[PDB]
Amino acid sequence: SSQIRQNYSTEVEAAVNRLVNLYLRASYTYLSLGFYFDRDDVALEGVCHFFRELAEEKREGAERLLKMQNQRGGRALFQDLQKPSQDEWGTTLDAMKAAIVLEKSLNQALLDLHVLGSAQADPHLCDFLESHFLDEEVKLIKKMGDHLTNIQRLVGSQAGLGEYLFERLTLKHD
Amino acid sequence: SSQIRQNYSTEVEAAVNRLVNLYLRASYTYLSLGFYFDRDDVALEGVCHFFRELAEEKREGAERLLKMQNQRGGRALFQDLQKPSQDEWGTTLDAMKAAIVLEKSLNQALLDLHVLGSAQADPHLCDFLESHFLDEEVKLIKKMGDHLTNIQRLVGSQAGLGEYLFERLTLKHD
Amino acid sequence: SSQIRQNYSTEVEAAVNRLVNLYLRASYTYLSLGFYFDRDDVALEGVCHFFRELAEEKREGAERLLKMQNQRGGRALFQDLQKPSQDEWGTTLDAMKAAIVLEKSLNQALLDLHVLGSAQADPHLCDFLESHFLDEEVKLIKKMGDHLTNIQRLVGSQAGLGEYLFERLTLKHD
Amino acid sequence: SSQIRQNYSTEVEAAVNRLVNLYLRASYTYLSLGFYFDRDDVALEGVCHFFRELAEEKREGAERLLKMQNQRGGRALFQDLQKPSQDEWGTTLDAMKAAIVLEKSLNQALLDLHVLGSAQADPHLCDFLESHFLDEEVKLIKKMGDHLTNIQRLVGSQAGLGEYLFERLTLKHD
Amino acid sequence: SSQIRQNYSTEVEAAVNRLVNLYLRASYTYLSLGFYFDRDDVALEGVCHFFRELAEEKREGAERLLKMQNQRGGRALFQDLQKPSQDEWGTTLDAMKAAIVLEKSLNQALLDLHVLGSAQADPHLCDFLESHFLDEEVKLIKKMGDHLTNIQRLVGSQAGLGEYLFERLTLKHD
Amino acid sequence: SSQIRQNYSTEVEAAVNRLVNLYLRASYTYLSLGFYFDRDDVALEGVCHFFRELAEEKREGAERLLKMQNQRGGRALFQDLQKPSQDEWGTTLDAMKAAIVLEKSLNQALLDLHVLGSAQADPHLCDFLESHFLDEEVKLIKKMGDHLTNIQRLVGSQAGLGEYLFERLTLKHD
Ligand SMILES: [Cl-]
Ligand SMILES: [Cl-]
Ligand SMILES: [Cl-]
Ligand SMILES: [Cl-]
Ligand SMILES: [Cl-]
Ligand SMILES: [Cl-]
Incomplete structure (x- = not known):
């Protein structure tokens, strides 16, 4: 099959696909955390921003893994993404x-x-x-x-x- | 009568005039709120500024409604403005x-x-x-x-x- | 009561509150004058602008009086604002x-x-x-x-x- | 037929084509008005410019409707354009x-x-x-x-x- | 419960949460499409870029819906995200x-x-x-x-x- | 009648009015050609742009003729504009x-x-x-x-x- 693949095991290829799922799960968890702290009855802007930034970071980590999978000649395979562990x-x-x-x-x-x-x-x-x-x-x-x-x-x-005080004086807000 | 009026009901025209009164009432309420927080025995500058800004916003909303009333060919009609609900x-x-x-x-x-x-x-x-x-x-x-x-x-x-702390760390002041 | 008030009579304090009402009344009169001259069947833009500017000026005078009332340790008290004397x-x-x-x-x-x-x-x-x-x-x-x-x-x-001619050649317009 | 059309009725499609004809008719009316006021025996430059600008505006409205017709997957259909209602x-x-x-x-x-x-x-x-x-x-x-x-x-x-005086002091000219 | 919610039905609130799931599903579909076209045995860079951009767009649409849900006083609720319909x-x-x-x-x-x-x-x-x-x-x-x-x-x-030719001459690439 | 007209025959005056009709007809033909190539089932952007530019050019030619008609003291006379020869x-x-x-x-x-x-x-x-x-x-x-x-x-x-290829490599597009 692959014209470029060299020294890239099937075990690693599968584990990379699983790790992508883990990072996208984590990104989704942070999206939920972020919007919880944006609720009018929670209203901690610095906390919201902290977690929204992490959602982006975890997304980017998944993208880097996917890029690497193609660079090595493995095949990206996506699975369902479970929802976060909590709603609140x-x-x-x-x-x-x-x-x-x-x-x-x-x-x-x-x-x-x-x-x-x-x-x-x-x-x-x-x-x-x-x-x-x-x-x-x-x-x-x-x-x-x-x-x-x-x-x-x-x-x-x-x-x-x-x-x-923590939100105001440690976390980044406008 | 009107040379420009088209598809503009008398009901809407009257309701717009009433809404102008509501917005100017609200502006007056915010003026009072603002000057209360400027009292030397209250002295919360960020709170004062918050409400003074809203008084201007509500004034501007009333002006926009009045502009629109003339654009449609209705007639602005002004009524007495009641004082705010509280003095303190x-x-x-x-x-x-x-x-x-x-x-x-x-x-x-x-x-x-x-x-x-x-x-x-x-x-x-x-x-x-x-x-x-x-x-x-x-x-x-x-x-x-x-x-x-x-x-x-x-x-x-x-x-x-x-x-x-709220006045100092959330609200805008000098 | 007041920690700052000095040489500020109750008579002056009351008269200042009345004067605020007079200036806000005047501001409202000018708002009405302004929007009358914006009517499509009146349409004198320079006249509209002249009176709209005066509405702002009278508002500002009222605000200055209110600021001064607090600086002296008096208490702003707002009353109902009567509508202007004419609709047209x-x-x-x-x-x-x-x-x-x-x-x-x-x-x-x-x-x-x-x-x-x-x-x-x-x-x-x-x-x-x-x-x-x-x-x-x-x-x-x-x-x-x-x-x-x-x-x-x-x-x-x-x-x-x-x-x-007066509107065009004396009063300020676009 | 159309690969993109969604929620776009034949009735709306036809009415849009008719509206294009109305706007192009209006553009043509303004072209005629404009050139009438450019006649040496009429010679009201600001009036000429006012109507020439409206001819362009109505043309542009027709173009926007045509763009929208294609965006929705309707078919532009052009009909004859009647001449303006007057020659003078x-x-x-x-x-x-x-x-x-x-x-x-x-x-x-x-x-x-x-x-x-x-x-x-x-x-x-x-x-x-x-x-x-x-x-x-x-x-x-x-x-x-x-x-x-x-x-x-x-x-x-x-x-x-x-x-x-109106042409000189209200309307835009060189 | 909510201190801000006004004129916001439970039906709309639920439908917004479902729509968020649909947009995040779509984002995931585009992520998969993008990385497929990055495969060394597919290798259509402009096609890859087209779909990666859409993955970002759909993510952003979901974020806008979530922002709006909080602005109205509804509660974001996240569900599992199904994987895309195809692997290739x-x-x-x-x-x-x-x-x-x-x-x-x-x-x-x-x-x-x-x-x-x-x-x-x-x-x-x-x-x-x-x-x-x-x-x-x-x-x-x-x-x-x-x-x-x-x-x-x-x-x-x-x-x-x-x-x-389509990839080279229509789609955006480096 | 005309105070400016000199050496300008009635025959020329009429032929200029006819030529205006021909140029506006041509402009309309190009408008139709342009929007045809903008159809989602045609989709040749460079071809669309080519003909839209010609519609503007022919409009401008008609305007120049009309200007000249007035400069010479003739009278612009507009007639109905026939629709283009084809719909597709x-x-x-x-x-x-x-x-x-x-x-x-x-x-x-x-x-x-x-x-x-x-x-x-x-x-x-x-x-x-x-x-x-x-x-x-x-x-x-x-x-x-x-x-x-x-x-x-x-x-x-x-x-x-x-x-x-012709649309991509000869005609001007974005
Ligand atoms: Cl789960
Ligand atoms: Cl009252
Ligand atoms: Cl009264
Ligand atoms: Cl006709
Ligand atoms: Cl599935
Ligand atoms: Cl015909």
């Missing part, structure tokens, strides 16, 4: 906890694919993940952890005040 | 609640005039309201709802602190 | 005569408040009126008088011609 | 009266097509007319009405003087 | 035929929601669709129809040549 | 053949009027045609002939391919 996301703290859980699941999927690529002696795949995904994920998880700590310190006995 | 407006929360009530009453008057225009097969009137009023009102009511949520979250057990 | 304003000459009458009534109210301020030994009030109102009114009444003379000279036996 | 157009007043009559006939045709579109549940057609035709027509009829009033006021007992 | 999309002609079918299904959903909004006397919804969706869809379907005609004329007896 | 224009080749036929008929009318002007010893008319019409027509007919030759060479056994 609670407080900023609840939301940021759910986001860290989601990011750790993406990071583990990256690490798992690196293990497979390594076992298949596929250095192009391994360096692709190293160069465009692993550090991006470490940096984002650090950021989220920083945010969680600041959110947690602001709860005190005045949760509403703290949630407002 | 309480807290920012009280004020923002009164403002949302006022805006919903203007929105219902717009919707009622759209019903009449539709029934009179007056598409110029219907598109005039759609193009220059309905979405402006939806956007403003959303904004006010967002504000109400943030005000409410800041009350906690420290109402003065929360009222200060 | 006749010729440019009729309109300019009504405007001069209106301006002389505002000027007399200014002068009356100056008398009260003087009697109450309130030099801040007296200089406020001198600096921001008295000369503005003298200048406007002179302008209107100039206009009345030119309108009157153009009536001749050809009233329509003269009314057109 | 009388005074500026006669001409402006004929123009208002013409514009009211175009406005009624627009309104009639809106009724048909509404009855056919064709919201694209209805919004097309609302967005690009109805307000343009209301604005033009208001302008013409304004002009008629000023022309009429200038007739007096000196018709030639008034006709000159 | 055939020729440019096959692909463009599938795209027109997809667009006509989105257009019918828009028209159906307009019918519901009209029946619910919801003019804000109706004008929202008119202003941001209906004409965009008519323009896109016209474009696709134009493309289909040119593709079809190029098939002749030399399908590969024609498919190359 | 076939292939680019069919269309370009019809256009050359049309242009040769305009050229012969120009030449015929030059004969009349010459016989009437009307050098202003003769030079007017020489300076603004005769060479423009020769240049356009040469262009059309060039186009016909290239269209004809591209028919071969692959008519659709050739028609596409």
Whole structure:
């Protein structure tokens, strides 16, 4: 079949298609998180913007994987995309906890694919993940952890005040 | 009589004059709200500015209706303007609640005039309201709802602190 | 009560609130005059613009009085606003005569408040009126008088011609 | 037949073709009006320019309808274009009266097509007319009405003087 | 419940959520179409770019609907997203035929929601669709129809040549 | 009658009015040709643009004749405008053949009027045609002939391919 494919296992090809589904799932989760914080009865603009930006980031990660799949001569295969785990996301703290859980699941999927690529002696795949995904994920998880700590310190006995202040003074808004 | 009037019912003409009175009433309400928050014993500059801007907006809406009345060949008729419902407006929360009530009453008057225009097969009137009023009102009511949520979250057990913080960190001031 | 109020009589405070009502009444009168001259069966654009500008000027005068009321520690109190004296304003000459009458009534109210301020030994009030109102009114009444003379000279036996020419060659239009 | 046509009735398609004929008729009427006022024995340059501009406007309206007909998958069908109603157009007043009559006939045709579109549940057609035709027509009829009033006021007992003055001081010329 | 919701039916709210699912489905379909034409054994860059741009457009339409849902005080509810109808999309002609079918299904959903909004006397919804969706869809379907005609004329007896030429000389590429 | 007319025969005056009708007929023919090539089932943008430009050119020629008629003191007289000869224009080749036929008929009318002007010893008319019409027509007919030759060479056994290529590589498009 493929005129270009070289050193690209069927196992890696399938795992890349699965990883695309995971990233598009994550993008959809962030879309939902974003619009929840835009509700008039929630109304935390900086929180909305934070998650909308992540929805775009995860979309872009999926696109990069798809580009790479074609560069290697694999075939993109798309599956249904499950809806996010919740319809309502609670407080900023609840939301940021759910986001860290989601990011750790993406990071583990990256690490798992690196293990497979390594076992298949596929250095192009391994360096692709190293160069465009692993550090991006470490940096984002650090950021989220920083945010969680600041959110947690602001709860005190005045949760509403703290949630407002975090949105106003840490998160980016107009 | 009119050399230009075409497809413009007497019912619509009268309802437009009434709507002008409603908008000028609303402008006057906002003038009063604005100067209340400028009192030395109230002194919330961002709140003052918010309502003064709305007084100008409602004035402008009345002017647009009057322009349209002449464009269609109707006759502007002005009636007395009642004073606002209160002389003192309480807290920012009280004020923002009164403002949302006022805006919903203007929105219902717009919707009622759209019903009449539709029934009179007056598409110029219907598109005039759609193009220059309905979405402006939806956007403003959303904004006010967002504000109400943030005000409410800041009350906690420290109402003065929360009222200060909202004025400082959400509303526009010098 | 007031933490800032000093040398500010209740009599002056009330008279300022009344003067605000007079200026907003005058603004409303000019709004009506303006839209009358915008009628397709009247259609004197320069006349329309002249009165619309005065509606804005009178609004601004009311706002300045309200600002001053708060600066002195008085309390703004708003009353109903009566509608203008006429629904239709006749010729440019009729309109300019009504405007001069209106301006002389505002000027007399200014002068009356100056008398009260003087009697109450309130030099801040007296200089406020001198600096921001008295000369503005003298200048406007002179302008209107100039206009009345030119309108009157153009009536001749050809009233329509003269009314057109005055609008075209004295008043500001596009 | 058509690969793109959706929700586009034969009735609307035919009425659009008729409306194109009406607009091109109107354009031709304005061409004739324009060149009449360019005659050396008429010689009212501002009047000539006014009508030549309207000939272009009506041409453009016909072109927009034709574009829309193709966008919806209808078929443009052209019919003969009748010549204007007069060869000589009388005074500026006669001409402006004929123009208002013409514009009211175009406005009624627009309104009639809106009724048909509404009855056919064709919201694209209805919004097309609302967005690009109805307000343009209301604005033009208001302008013409304004002009008629000023022309009429200038007739007096000196018709030639008034006709000159209107052309010089209201209408655009070099 | 909602502090802002006014004249916004539960029926419209649900239909908007369904329409979001339809637009995100369409975006996913275009993502798949785009990456198919990027395959080394397909390799039609202009075709790839055409569909990738549409994936972004449909995403943006879904985002606009979600924004509007919150502006009106409805609640966004997300459902699973089905995968596209095909894994391989055939020729440019096959692909463009599938795209027109997809667009006509989105257009019918828009028209159906307009019918519901009209029946619910919801003019804000109706004008929202008119202003941001209906004409965009008519323009896109016209474009696709134009493309289909040119593709079809190029098939002749030399399908590969024609498919190359269309991609090179009609579609945008680097 | 005319204060300016000199050396301008009634025969020339009438022939100029007829020539205006011919040019406006030709403009209408080109309008129809243009919109035919804009049909979604025809879709040859460069061909559409070619004929739309000619519709404008022929309109302008009619306007120049009308200007000249007034400059000489003749009287413009407009007649009904017949619709174009066809509703559907076939292939680019069919269309370009019809256009050359049309242009040769305009050229012969120009030449015929030059004969009349010459016989009437009307050098202003003769030079007017020489300076603004005769060479423009020769240049356009040469262009059309060039186009016909290239269209004809591209028919071969692959008519659709050739028609596409001509539109793409000879005619001006976006
Ligand atoms: Cl699920
Ligand atoms: Cl009252
Ligand atoms: Cl009264
Ligand atoms: Cl006729
Ligand atoms: Cl499925
Ligand atoms: Cl015929």
